[PDB]
Design a protein around this ligand. Sequence first.
Ligand code: NA
Lengths: 165, 166, 163, 166, 166, 165, 165, 163, 166, 165
Amino acid sequence: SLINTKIKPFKNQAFKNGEFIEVTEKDTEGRWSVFFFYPADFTFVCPTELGDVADHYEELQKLGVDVYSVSTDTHFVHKAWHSSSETIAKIKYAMIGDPTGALTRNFDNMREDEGLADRATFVVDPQGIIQAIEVTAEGIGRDASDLLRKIKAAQYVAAHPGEVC
Amino acid sequence: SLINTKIKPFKNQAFKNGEFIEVTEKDTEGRWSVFFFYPADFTFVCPTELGDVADHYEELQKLGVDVYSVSTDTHFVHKAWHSSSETIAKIKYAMIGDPTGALTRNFDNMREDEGLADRATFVVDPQGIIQAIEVTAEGIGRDASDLLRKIKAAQYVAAHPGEVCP
Amino acid sequence: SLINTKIKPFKNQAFKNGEFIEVTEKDTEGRWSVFFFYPADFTFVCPTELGDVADHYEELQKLGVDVYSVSTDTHFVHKAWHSSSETIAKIKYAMIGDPTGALTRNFDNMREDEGLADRATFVVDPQGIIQAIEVTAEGIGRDASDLLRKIKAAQYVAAHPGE
Amino acid sequence: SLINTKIKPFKNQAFKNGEFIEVTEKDTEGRWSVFFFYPADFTFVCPTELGDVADHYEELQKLGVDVYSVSTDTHFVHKAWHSSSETIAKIKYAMIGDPTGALTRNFDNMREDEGLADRATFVVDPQGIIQAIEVTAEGIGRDASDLLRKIKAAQYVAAHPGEVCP
Amino acid sequence: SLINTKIKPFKNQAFKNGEFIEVTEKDTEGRWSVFFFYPADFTFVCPTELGDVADHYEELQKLGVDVYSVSTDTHFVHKAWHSSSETIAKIKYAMIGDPTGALTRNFDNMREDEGLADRATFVVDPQGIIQAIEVTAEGIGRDASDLLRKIKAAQYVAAHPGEVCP
Amino acid sequence: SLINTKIKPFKNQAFKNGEFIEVTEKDTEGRWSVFFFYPADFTFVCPTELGDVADHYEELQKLGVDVYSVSTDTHFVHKAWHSSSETIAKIKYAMIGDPTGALTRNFDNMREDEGLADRATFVVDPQGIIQAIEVTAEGIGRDASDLLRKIKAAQYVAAHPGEVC
Amino acid sequence: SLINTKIKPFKNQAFKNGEFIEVTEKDTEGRWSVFFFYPADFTFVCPTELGDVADHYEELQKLGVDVYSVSTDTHFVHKAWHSSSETIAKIKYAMIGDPTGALTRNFDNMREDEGLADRATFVVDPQGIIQAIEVTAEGIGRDASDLLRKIKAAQYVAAHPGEVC
Amino acid sequence: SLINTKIKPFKNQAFKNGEFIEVTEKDTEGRWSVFFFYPADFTFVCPTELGDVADHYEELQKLGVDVYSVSTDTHFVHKAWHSSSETIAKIKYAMIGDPTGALTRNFDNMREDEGLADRATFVVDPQGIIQAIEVTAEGIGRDASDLLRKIKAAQYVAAHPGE
Amino acid sequence: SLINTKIKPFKNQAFKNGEFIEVTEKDTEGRWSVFFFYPADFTFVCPTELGDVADHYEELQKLGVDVYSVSTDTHFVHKAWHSSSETIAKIKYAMIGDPTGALTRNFDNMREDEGLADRATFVVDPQGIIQAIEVTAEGIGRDASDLLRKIKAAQYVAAHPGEVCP
Amino acid sequence: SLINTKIKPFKNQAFKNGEFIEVTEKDTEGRWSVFFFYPADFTFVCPTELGDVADHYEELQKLGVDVYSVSTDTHFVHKAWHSSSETIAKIKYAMIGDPTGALTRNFDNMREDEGLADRATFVVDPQGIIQAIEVTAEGIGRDASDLLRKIKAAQYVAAHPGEVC
Ligand code: NA
C-alpha cells in the first residue's frame, strides 16, 4: 500500500481559475494536500464528487488544505470543461492534466487498459506523507464531508501523537 | 490499486461467536463482503472501529453483507480478545487470523516493517470484485456509517446500471 | 521506416456523427484508410487541417476512402469539441480517442514526454499497407488537396503496376 | 546448522513483569542467554515447557543466565497471556514479541507455512556464540533440567578448556 | 518518429555542378536544408520528381534553402547521370552519394532488403531539427510546390512562436 | 530448520559389527532412525557420547529404533577405531563413513572450513520426517537418556495425534 | 580465409548485353565460375582490369568458364556504363549489381568504410569450392593471363587428384 | 597440465614424528618438496609405497628435500595409523591430513565421488614450480628409487640450464 | 586428474616403419597402449628417451603393448627424422603426428604458449582407462624400465582384482 | 579480408642460413615485406613454390624487400629441411616457424582442420599495410614473377598517390 509513503516528484500543467499553471511536488511541501483522481472530463457522469469538494474548498483552504483534482485529460480540456459545466465552474482549485500518466502512475492509480486514472483520493501531509487513501468504483460516490472529517482527524493526530483513544 | 479486481483465493482460521472455523474465498461467493483490516489485538488503542462495525452488523446482515475483520494475530488470540474486551465481545462476525500475512498481502495491505496490517476496509461484491477501498493511518478513524452508505451505493449500482446522473 | 509495412491491430472508441462506436484494424480491411493524427482537442491552434479534410470527405467517400482522425483525447472529449468549434462540426468521419496511446504508438507517432500524438497522416491501402506518410511540426499545416492527390496516385499505382 | 555461530543483531519489544521493554543483541553481551522459541500464545496446548523454564529461572539467574521466550505474537499478546494463564503468570523473564519474524528467522527457526516459530531452545554464551541448539516437533517436550545440565557443561568448558576426558 | 529531432552527423561525397564536393552536418548548420531521398539513378522511372525540385531551385535558393538529393549511388554515378538525362542536367543542387547507407539510415529511410533509400523528403531547420517529413511508395509523386508551401510555413512559424488562432 | 522435513536420499559405506555394509535411505523406510553425527574418529575426546548410545542400543532396538553414527572418516577408520577402543568396541550399530560429506551436507551439518560434521543428532520417523534435532559444541555432552525420552515422546505423538497436554 | 570453402547462396540482378537477368548460385552449379569484384562504375580510374577479362572471354568461354563481375552498384548503372564506355562495351559476361552488399559480404570482400567491394577475384570449381583468391589494393592491378593460368591449373589438378611432385 | 605451474596456497594440519604441526605453502618456499598422495589410511592395500619413501627419507633429507604424504584422513587418523602399522612407523616425514580436500583439489587430484585423493606424487622446486608428476591407479605401485632419480635430475637441471 | 578416465576419440596420421598409417581410438581398443609424448623432433636434446623405449619395444610387443610416440610435428617430419638420427632409426612403433594438437589436448598435455606437447607418458588399459601417468619438465628423464615395471603391474592388477596385502 | 589492414604484432623463431633468429613485426617496420605461407616441410609435394622465390631473392633484395616464409613447423624442422633438400638450400631468406599457429592466424590463413597454413602470399608495405593477398589450393601454384610485378606496382603506386588512368 502507498499508505505512509512519501509522494513522488511530479510536474504537470493545470488549469486554475482562468489560467494555466505548472504544479510540482515543491508546491505541496509545507502544506496539506488532497489529490483527487477521476477517470475523465466530459463523460456522462455528473461531476457531483468534484462539486462537493468545490463546495467545501473554502473550509479546506481554512484548514490549510490544497486541492488538486487530476485526470489524464489535458489542461486544455479542463479549461473547456470548466467554462462549460455548472458544477465544474464552481471549482477554484487547480485542475491538473496528466496526459503522460506519470502522476497517475506515481500514485499507482492507472487503469492501464483504459489509460484513465481510477477514482481515488489521497490525503498528503506537510512532510509529503500519504495519510489516507480512498478509491471507489463507478457509482459509489466519494463524500466530501467524510473527506473533511479525515483531514481534521489527520491534522489532530499530527498535533497530538499517540492519542490513546 | 486493487480497485475493480477480483479477490485472491485464501484459507484462514477464524473466531466466530465462541467457536473456530475455516474461511476461504468460497465463503464469499454469492455474498457481499467487508474485509476489515486492523493492526493488532490487545493494544492500547481504542477498538472504536471494531465496535462500530459490530453495532451496524445486524444492519449489514439485513443487506446480505458478511463481515470479516482481519489482523496478523492468530485466531487463538482473537478468541482471547473477544472474551476480555467488552467492545470486542459485541462481535458476532468472523474474526480472521492471518499469522502468515498471506490474506493481508493478497489485499496489498501489509506494513512490512512491522508485520502488521494497515487500517483498511474493502467492499467486495458477490462476484468477488473489489468495489471500494479505504486505508488510513493510525488515529484517523473509519466511519461505519460512511461505509454503509458506500455499500448501499454499490448495491444500487449493481442493481441499476446506467442511472448515474447526466 | 513504416512505409510499405502493415498496420497493426488496434481497438479504440471513437465519436462519429453524434454517436460512439468502436473501430479496429478489421474495419480497415478491404478499404483505403487515412489516419490523421493531431496533438490535442481544445487547444488554441486553428483547426484548419481537420476542416480541410472534412471539406473533402465526399471526394474521399466517393473514392472508397475512410478517414480516421486520431488524438490521445477520449472520445467524450471529441464529442464535446464537435460542438464547441464550428470547424470541427463539419467532420462526418470517425474521431478516434486514444488515451492508452496504443494506436499512436503502433504508428510510432508518440511525443513520449507530452503524451500527445505528432501531426502525421498515414495513407493505408486495402491490404493494410502504409503507402504514404506525412509528418509536420506545429505551425506547418497539412493541405487536404495534396492528400487527395497522393491518394488517387496510390489507388492508381495499385491498379497499374509498372511506371 | 547455526552451531558455533554468532547471533545476529535484533530489536524487539517484550513483556517483562508488568511492563514493556525493548531488547536488542546488546542486552545479551557479557551474559549467558537462553532464547526459548515456541509456536503461539493462547493455544490449546500445554504451556508445560514455559512453566518449566519459569521454575528453573531463579536458578538460571544464579548462574548469570538470562532467558528470553519468543513467538511471532506481539508483546501486547504476551502481556494478555501473562495476566490470564496461571502457568504463564509465573514468568519473570522477558517475553519477546516477533510479529515480523526477523528474530525467528535470524535463528533459522521459522515454519514459513504457518508464520509461527518452531519449538527450539538456543544457548548463547557471553560472546554471543551459539553453544547448544535443540528443536523438536509438536508434542515432543523440552526438558528444562537437561537444558540446565547443558548450560553448566557449557560454562564449565568455557572456564576449563582442554579438560575433555582422554 | 524522427520528427522534431536533430539530424545526426555525416560525411558524404556529392556532385554539384561539375565538381565533386564533400558534405557534412557542419554545412547544414545555421541553414535550412532539404534532404530529398530517392531509390536509384539510371532507372526507367520518370526523373520528374527531381526535375520539379530543380525547377524551383532558384525560388528556394532565394528563401535561403539548400537542397541535397540522396541515393545510395556513388557520387560518380550522379555525375554520369547528370549528363545523360536532360532532366537531371537541370540540377544545380548537390547530389549526395550514400553507398554506405549511413546517411540514409541516420534518417531511418533505408529499404534494407533492397540496399536503396525510400522516397522521403526531410526539412531541417537552422538548429538541425527535422520540421517536415514525407515518404511515399514507388509511384506516388511528391509535389515540389507543396514542399515550397511548407518551407515557407516552417520559417514563418520559426519567427512567430505561438501563432494563436486569429 | 530441517525440523519437519523429509530426509534426503543417501548411499554410504559403513562398519557394522565386524564387516562393511552399504546403507541408503531405503534402509530407514518403515523404521525410526537416529543419525548421530560427530566430528572425528581417533580424536582425543572420550567417546562417552557414542558409548552411552551404545549402552541404550538394546532398548532402542526394542523401540524399533535404528542407529547410525556418522562422521567424515572412512568406514576403514571406523573399523580400526572400533577394534581399538574400549568404548567404541561396545558399538553394535552401523558406523557410517561420509568422506564425500554428502550425507553430512544432506543434514546441513558440515563445518565447511574443517571438513568435519558438527555434533548433531537427528530423530527421523518411519515416514522419513525429522522430529527432533540436537546440536552441541565441543564439551557440551549429548545425553542418551534424554534422547530415549524424546524418541518415546515422538513415538507417542505418532500414536496419539493432537494430544492436548 | 574462404579458400577451399563452398560459396554461399545468392540472388542478384545483372546486366548481360541488353538483357537484365537474375543470377543465383544455382546458375553456377556445374560450371567453373569467376567472380571479379571491383570498387565502382563510372570512376576516373582505368576500366582496364575489366576490359582485359573480356579480351579473354573467348578462351574462358572455351574452358567452360563463366564470368560474373560484381560491384555494389545497381544493374541499372552497369547498363548505363556498358554502353557509355568503350572497354566496358566489350563485356559479354554477366555484370552483377550488389547494392545490398550481400554477395560481396559472402565473399568477405567489403570496404565497410566505403560501401564498395575490394579488388578481388575468385575461382570457383563446379562444386562451388573456391580454388583461388586474389585481392589487391587500388593501383596494383590483376593480370588476366595469371588468372587463366590458375584456372587451367585448377581444372587440371581436378583431373588428376593429388599431383605428386 | 599442472606441470611447470606454481603450487597454490594451503594450510593443513599434519602429524610428524609424535607431534601435530601446521604446514602451509610458506614452509615449502625455498626447499624442494615431494607431495605424496594416497587414497586412505587403514585400508587393506600394502603400505609399501610409503615405506619405500621412508627408507629414502635420509637421502632426500641430505638432498634438501622435504616429504609430505597427503590423504583426506585427519591428522588424528595419521597419528593412529602410525602405531598400527610397522611400515607406517618408519615414517619420519610429515603426514598431512586433508579432510576439507582443499590441498588435494589444488593439485586437481580428487576422486570426487569417493572423496579420496588419487595415487599421485608431485616434485616441487624451491620456487613452488611443479617439475614432475606421477599418478597411478590402485595396484600399480610407485618406486621410491625412480623418484629419487627424478629429484636428482630436477636439482641438476635447475643448476645446469641447457641440455 | 585424467587418471582413471577413458581416452577420447582421435584421428591422426603417423609414421611406422617406412609407411604412413592412420590411427584412431579404434586401434587402441582391446589393447594395452602407451602414449609417449615429447615436445619436438630435430632439436638438440638427446633423443635418448625415445631410444630407451625402442630398446624395450621387443619386450613390450611380447607383453601385448602398442606404443605411439606423439609430438605436434607432422608425420612427414617423423619420417625425415627417423632417417636422420641413428637413435630414431631404431623406432619400430608408430610415430603419431598431432599438428592440430587435438590428441595432445585430449590428454591435457599441451604447452599452450609453445604449441608443443609436454613430456608425458600415458598407459591406457584394454577398456581405454588411463592407468598410469607421468609428466616431467624438460631435462628430467623418463625411465623406460620403470615404464615396463608399471605395465606389468597394471596387467597383474587387471587380473587380480582386490589383491589384498599378503 | 585483410587487404589494406596493418599486420598484427608477432614473435617467432626462424632459420636464416645457419643461425636461428627471433623475428617480430619490429623487424618489418620500414621495409617492404613478403610473407610466404605454405602447408609443411618434408612433404612429397614440389618445393618449387619456395625455391622460385629464392631464384628472385637477388632482385627482391635489390627492391629493399625482405622475405619471411612461414609454416606451422618449428624452426628446428626448417633447418633440417634447408640442409637436406636442394631447392630448400637456395633459401637465404628467413624461414619462420609458427608451431602455435599465431602468426598464421593473424593472417587468417589457417586450416583449423589440419593445423597447417594455406598457400597464401602477402605483400606488406613499410607501414605494415597489407597491399596484396594471394591464396590458392593444393596444386594451383603461385608465380614468382607475378609476385614481383605486384611488388613493383605496389612500390610505384606508393610513389605517385592515386594514379589516375
Ligand atoms: Na504474526
